[PDB]
Design a protein around this ligand. Sequence first.
Ligand code: HEM
Ligand code: HEM
Ligand code: HEM
Ligand code: HEM
Ligand SMILES: [Cl-]
Ligand SMILES: [Cl-]
Ligand SMILES: [Cl-]
Ligand SMILES: [Cl-]
Ligand SMILES: [Cl-]
Ligand SMILES: [Mg+2]
Ligand SMILES: [Mg+2]
Ligand SMILES: [Mg+2]
Ligand SMILES: [Mg+2]
Ligand SMILES: [Zn+2]
Ligand SMILES: [Zn+2]
Ligand SMILES: [Zn+2]
Ligand SMILES: [Zn+2]
Ligand SMILES: [Zn+2]
Ligand SMILES: [Zn+2]
Ligand SMILES: [Zn+2]
Ligand SMILES: [Zn+2]
Lengths: 106, 106, 106, 106
Amino acid sequence: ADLEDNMETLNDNLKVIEKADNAAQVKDALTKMAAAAADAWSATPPKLEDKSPDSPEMHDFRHGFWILIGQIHDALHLANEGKVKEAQHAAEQLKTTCNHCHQAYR
Amino acid sequence: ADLEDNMETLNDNLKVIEKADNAAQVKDALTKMAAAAADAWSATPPKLEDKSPDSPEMHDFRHGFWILIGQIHDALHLANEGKVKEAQHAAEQLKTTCNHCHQAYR
Amino acid sequence: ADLEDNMETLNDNLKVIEKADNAAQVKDALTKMAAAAADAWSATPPKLEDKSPDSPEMHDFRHGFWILIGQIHDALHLANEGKVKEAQHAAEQLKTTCNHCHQAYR
Amino acid sequence: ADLEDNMETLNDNLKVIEKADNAAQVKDALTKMAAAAADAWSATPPKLEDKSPDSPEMHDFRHGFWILIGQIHDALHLANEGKVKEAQHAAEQLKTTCNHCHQAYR
Ligand code: HEM
Ligand code: HEM
Ligand code: HEM
Ligand code: HEM
Ligand SMILES: [Cl-]
Ligand SMILES: [Cl-]
Ligand SMILES: [Cl-]
Ligand SMILES: [Cl-]
Ligand SMILES: [Cl-]
Ligand SMILES: [Mg+2]
Ligand SMILES: [Mg+2]
Ligand SMILES: [Mg+2]
Ligand SMILES: [Mg+2]
Ligand SMILES: [Zn+2]
Ligand SMILES: [Zn+2]
Ligand SMILES: [Zn+2]
Ligand SMILES: [Zn+2]
Ligand SMILES: [Zn+2]
Ligand SMILES: [Zn+2]
Ligand SMILES: [Zn+2]
Ligand SMILES: [Zn+2]
């Protein structure tokens, strides 16, 4: 999928997680976020289109996806263990990763 | 790219890293491995073609990619710091991740 | 050292990182935080003194140190790469981990 | 505890995990390994006794503990999810980390 659609998937599933009542809902949403974050790896955003594909700037951009991907990984373990509230808290906390990349690269 | 092509990219760049004698070669190779691992996320392996796309078995398959992605992340930091030998050691260590997924799913 | 001494080390060095001008200052501070976080692992916090040493509650308490330790690890790589502002951002993101444990267990 | 006691704890519990029949046995063993790895952070290994406690060499030594600690974290999630075999495999994958540090520093 394109970067924009992967970002919409992240947005939409964050809201699903916030409103969720049970593990299954949170797991399903985190599963979708994991796939969107991994698929976003290949994208070059408009504001870096004039940089070389493996420039320093592109390395720093992609670092944020490593952080996000790691955070989703941990949140899904918590949800898998039935720690629904803790998985929800983890999802709220990773908004900072979203925000940090947007501040620099959106 | 398809799973087989991403796997060839991973395999080829691991060999580049082994033979490398400067940071740039190792960084470039790890960069390519990071992209191939992320792109592999969406693939259904032949052995699980008869399972639902977000079955338990497919969750367990994809878990190995989180591990691999994390290991590539750390190796690139070591290479970025000019610790070329230590980045090469990290690359050797992450073969265990490759091997473990292959044993269960190849 | 006891938990309170390790907490003072964490608190003091977070402030050092905020006010730092160069990578060496940030690296030194993160180094100290890494040691304090690892040493804090063995502590029983006052509010869980009435629980068994390896109770579920104590497992959930120690999970926060895994998160903190991992965040310090990554921040030090950023500082080692000379990315002072990015290491400072990572340090600010650490506070969420600090705050979350305090809310639940202090 | 001293480094040798922490190393014996790691070694003993790896063998417990290998022979284990159920999740509880594996979780208990991984719990003990987590504590030993964190406690090992403060130790100076004999072969670096002539280096300053926060020398470059000591930084490189301690990096291996970040790796080990992270791996134990993940293994315990797998055990917590009831994935006994997969937690056992993760414990076996740990040995690469053990071996790497031993080769350079033991
Ligand atoms: C959970 C975390 C995140 C959420 C919820 C999120 C959400 C969004 C949304 C809703 C958009 C607008 C999408 C559209 O065009 O319709 C967007 C755009 C963008 N995001 Fe994210 N994002 C996240 C994480 C990240 C991270 C980690 C990075 C960089 C490493 C990033 C980089 C971007 C960029 C470059 C755009 C602009 C291109 C675009 O419009 O798609 N995002 N994000
Ligand atoms: C650096 C790590 C890895 C390396 C070097 C590696 C290398 C390879 C190679 C050479 C192949 C042969 C087929 C081809 O060229 O496409 C292959 C196939 C495969 N690998 Fe990997 N791999 C790695 C990691 C992983 C991981 C972590 C997983 C699963 C989580 C995985 C799953 C598979 C599967 C399912 C196949 C069979 C593909 C098919 O039959 O179409 N690999 N890998
Ligand atoms: C950078 C992160 C953190 C900072 C800056 C920080 C700072 C502090 C400070 C200033 C105190 C005051 C108590 C004292 O030192 O006498 C404290 C107490 C405490 N912190 Fe943290 N902390 C951090 C992370 C954590 C984490 C991750 C946990 C749990 C996983 C935690 C658990 C506690 C507990 C239980 C106390 C109460 C100790 C007592 O009452 O004796 N802290 N922390
Ligand atoms: C699961 C992983 C590991 C296992 C099973 C393990 C096991 C052992 C054992 C059985 C010893 C002999 C201890 C003695 O009685 O004196 C030892 C020594 C040692 N290990 Fe490890 N180890 C592991 C990981 C590590 C790591 C990651 C490092 C370094 C980062 C490390 C550094 C050392 C050093 C320096 C010694 C020699 C000092 C001593 O004798 O205690 N080990 N290890
Ligand atoms: Cl929570
Ligand atoms: Cl404890
Ligand atoms: Cl970086
Ligand atoms: Cl147990
Ligand atoms: Cl080495
Ligand atoms: Mg969706
Ligand atoms: Mg080839
Ligand atoms: Mg005291
Ligand atoms: Mg799992
Ligand atoms: Zn975790
Ligand atoms: Zn590292
Ligand atoms: Zn090495
Ligand atoms: Zn990093
Ligand atoms: Zn930043
Ligand atoms: Zn909280
Ligand atoms: Zn995991
Ligand atoms: Zn296995």
